[PDB]
Symmetry: C2
Amino acid sequence: EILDLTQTLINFPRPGDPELRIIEKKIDGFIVSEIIMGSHLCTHIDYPKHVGLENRIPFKDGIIKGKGYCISLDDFPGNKLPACDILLIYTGFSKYWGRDEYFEKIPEIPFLDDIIKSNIKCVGIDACTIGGFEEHKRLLSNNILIIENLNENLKNLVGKSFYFLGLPLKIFDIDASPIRCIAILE
Amino acid sequence: EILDLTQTLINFPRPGDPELRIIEKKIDGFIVSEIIMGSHLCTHIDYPKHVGLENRIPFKDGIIKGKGYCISLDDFPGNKLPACDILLIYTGFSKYWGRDEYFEKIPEIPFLDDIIKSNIKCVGIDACTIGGFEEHKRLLSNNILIIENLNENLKNLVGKSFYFLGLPLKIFDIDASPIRCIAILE
């Protein structure tokens, strides 16, 4: 039915980045909190503003949706990309989530050219990055959004077609937002 | 198809509550941000911790889902509640979103008793509150979650059956979270 692809929000920022802080207060019998987080913390979507470009409206209401397909990075050598709106890339690096090692695992995606020529609208990955500044800008400059730090459930989706929904914090004019991502399986 | 029921995140806290602050920095050609927000800012879900109780797992992965139904508060006098997992209540108070007046508009829901006897799992409303501490605790203490500050699109849903999805910031052990809410119409 529904598979959650989001990591639980934890204080596991990229080194250099703001820590997660949740400040709880007791007031008149209610418990209330303040949340302090960097925009790139945990499962998040990058917008073009992140690399100094103007954001656009590729998705109505900013709701990431459409047919999804998941490929394994190691299996996918000289292939036709799947016909999909959202391409998920399973690296296996999610195995290392929550461990410092994780931020040293940088995927090498040899078929970025092909993604840029496709009608893919967003790429998601179970890793901290799809690559460097240049790789991010290459995608973002060509109106392809990027979702990072997806969880290990991408493993379950490899070779499968599913419907993808990514619901960010409804902010516009930001470089990035925390995003809750699910796969709806048939 | 998909109707977004979420308010855009803006610096419109309940008086007394933390302001929204988004701090943007330029670093090595990237633009990055820090987000500071109260847990009850804009469209949010209340958990039992908000009234000093223990959170449970009524929804798998914390994903609010199921059959939805929307009723108009003024039309709904002595009625059978709809058969639904998620009950939305349209007050019209969303008309005043972003205006100080909005936080003075407090719904009076005479059928709270009936909600407590139903199998409804969550109640959502286009208003700042469903009522006072006692009304919140009455629902939360009986394992019914509460979504506040839904938008004016609830008007479009009155009398309709739809599928509801509410995707919060994946935090557990918090009193409340910002939640992105949609209706999937047939």
